[PDB]
Design a protein around this ligand. Structure first.
Ligand code: BR
Ligand code: BR
Ligand code: BR
Ligand code: BR
Ligand code: BR
Ligand code: BR
Ligand code: BR
Ligand code: BR
Ligand code: BR
Ligand code: BR
Ligand code: BR
Ligand code: BR
Ligand code: BR
Ligand code: BR
Ligand code: BR
Ligand code: BR
Lengths: 396, 396
């Protein structure tokens, strides 16, 4: 199968041996502890699940600066963004060098990981500014990711960690959450070799369903892994049970036998656009995908990034040979009146404007919300049923 | 796909809606609570995961007696064994009717479920005796399952429950544990229709590998679900990481593409032989299997059960039309010298004794433990490597 990034085998930090796991959980409860930031917690879950292989724990400032400035760590390995554990201070742990990291996102603040501290460093303004500007391509505090990065304090605690659980990401979504280790196992169980990954948080209307099918056909891929970013419900969001059902129904009814897996992972989105797209490729390679779809304004927010910047970063900023996964560059889809099917407009240079009909995901959901079925070119009835059954229970 | 037992859709008791899940977890921490038995905890996990669908919670004595005497509940539905929550007393909860059930198997005794108590009953000796004799077919306290059943107290607390997590079964085995809901989803993702399930706790040597392949061929099944019983490590047991690796390697190297899923579930084994075999068929139907393998002395212990009693119970004790799943009746395998392959001896009535070569799973493991490779007819090198690499790390 495709190799992991930077090693031959994945190096997850979750304690898979049950005896050692119980031992550590027991020791952890007696250790000095600190509640880390939601960002640091998601970083730990990704390392515990194998997504950030082969990282062994939280980076010191030299490695974080290297990831930010050159996507290169102090050992010369490739990694695209800093993976830090920033705190306001170290009051909570004083001089202890072995501590428990507690989860800010689960009531009671349970232990999430055990850490051996190798250094405690104060990040300077200059350094924080380089890490912010290089990753987010702006230092504007109105960019939510920039604000989040800069609202955790300046004390960087670095060293190796062992992870005890996958926070609320597995607890709340037991059927969807997967480690990179298990997605590789499932890809093999399916007998797939080339596999294209697609990230989504929204239910998939026909447009993204067709994008996945087009990419699978043009790449001659054996299957698609829909890899949902799992997280806390925000105002206006569609509840996961509904979103999950909508995507599973699309897979079950419209995809050929043995071509789609529906899964999820836990991390806090950076909204960093291009650099986050490189991170997305990195952990999709670790989970076993040979190809990853990146469309317009991938992982973006606001007006900070150019439409195709998250594709071109792979041509002009990612070091040569960094990864083995390939990018499938997507673009807007539409119904072609000439071909009577959904296409990416860029793939049919002979068409005219009047030859296409477009309906955005946003407009589709707006109609669904009013109990109106969009045209079949844009909405599958079985999927629409699920979403309208939901919307009518709250919009009536 | 095959329907669930007793309903058209599964009715798991896990709280899948995250908002309601957080609400209940929060309420639970303020409720009067009690640490239930390991048996009651496993019963709750099975109900939370959909395996015991459509049960809505713990049975009262009338339903438990009906399951024991006639595999039939007070509403006429089929269920083969009592699903009780027995306590020594109700001191811990007094007169509260809404309580939290805490887990005896996770340090700290975290909340596992919330329960609305509908009745509290004292089970009489006569009733305990009928439930023991009918399920275990012995009242001998030297039968470990009989002892366990009779060592939880006599106060039966009944009523509906909502389940908050899957105990240590998911926490310790995040990649293997599955709910019945997700195994159905994965079976569909694989595009399988007929599916044969096989339970094991031991790594699978060539004998059981070949049994699964024979059953898949004779049933024209699309795939096999290896469904491991997950649990705490006991003296002499092979650690799960090793066992899991041995089985995944067998699947990856020796099974055809897209024909095997490796999964697990959490429950405490009853060692009830025949009646437990009926329970195994019940929850395998709920997870989506159309066929379940039952070999000699399935789920037995000691000398309590006849070799094929766990097969014949389906002919003479299980009510007509109870379930839709079918049983694949297995028997001893051996290498046939005449056919130069592994066969079930019962399938080739023309052979003589000298025509077979047998090597038990126990003898295979004994050799592996000494660093000796059994013959290829009994041991796959890649699987043996995994097990010998393990044994040499502890037997040298
Ligand atoms: Br690996
Ligand atoms: Br944060
Ligand atoms: Br889920
Ligand atoms: Br290939
Ligand atoms: Br997304
Ligand atoms: Br949600
Ligand atoms: Br796009
Ligand atoms: Br839709
Ligand atoms: Br169902
Ligand atoms: Br027990
Ligand atoms: Br696991
Ligand atoms: Br069929
Ligand atoms: Br077993
Ligand atoms: Br173990
Ligand atoms: Br057998
Ligand atoms: Br073996």
């Amino acid at each position: 199968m495709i190799k992991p990034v930077g090693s031959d085998e994945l190096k997850p930090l979750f304690v898979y041996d049950p005896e050692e796991h119980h031992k550590l959980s027991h020791e952890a409860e007696s250790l000095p502890s600190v509640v880390i930031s939601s960002q640091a917690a998601g970083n730990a879950v990704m390392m515990g699940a194998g997504y950030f292989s082969p990282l062994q724990g939280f980076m010191n400032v030299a490695d974080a600066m290297g990831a930010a400035e050159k996507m290169t760590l102090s050992d010369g390995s490739f990694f695209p963004v800093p993976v830090l554990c920033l705190l306001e201070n170290t009051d909570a742990i004083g001089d202890a060098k072995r501590i428990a990291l507690r989860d800010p996102n689960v009531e009671g603040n349970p232990v999430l990981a055990v850490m051996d501290i190798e250094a405690i460093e104060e990040v300077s303004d200059e350094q924080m500014a380089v890490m912010t500007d290089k990753v987010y391509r702006t230092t504007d505090m109105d960019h939510i990711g920039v604000k989040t990065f800069n609202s955790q304090g300046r004390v960087a605690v670095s060293g190796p960690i062992q992870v005890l659980n996958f926070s609320y990401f597995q607890a709340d979504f037991p059927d969807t959450f997967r480690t990179a280790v298990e997605i590789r196992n499932e890809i093999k169980e399916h007998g797939w070799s080339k596999v294209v990954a697609f990230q989504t948080r929204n239910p998939m209307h026909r447009a993204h369903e067709e994008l996945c099918r087009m990419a699978m056909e043009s790449l001659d891929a054996d299957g698609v892994v829909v890899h949902m970013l799992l997280g806390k419900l925000k105002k206006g969001d569609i509840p996961a049970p509904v979103r999950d059902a909508a995507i599973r129904t699309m897979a079950e009814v419209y995809f050929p036998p043995n071509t789609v897996m529906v899964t999820g992972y836990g991390f806090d989105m950076l909204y960093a656009g291009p650099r986050e797209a490189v991170l997305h490729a990195y952990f999709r390679q670790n989970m076993g995908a040979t190809h990853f779809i990146i469309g317009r304004d991938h992982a973006g927010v606001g007006d900070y990034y150019g439409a195709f910047d998250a594709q071109t970063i792979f041509d002009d900023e990612v070091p040569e040979g960094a990864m083995e996964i390939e990018i499938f560059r997507a673009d807007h889809t539409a119904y072609s009146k000439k071909l009577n099917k959904i296409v990416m407009m860029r793939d049919v240079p002979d068409h005219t404007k009047e030859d296409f009909v477009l309906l955005s995901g946003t407009k589709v959901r707006e109609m669904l919300g009013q109990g109106i079925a969009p045209p079949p070119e844009f909405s599958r009835p079985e999927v629409a049923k699920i979403l309208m059954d939901y919307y009518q229970s709250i919009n009536s």
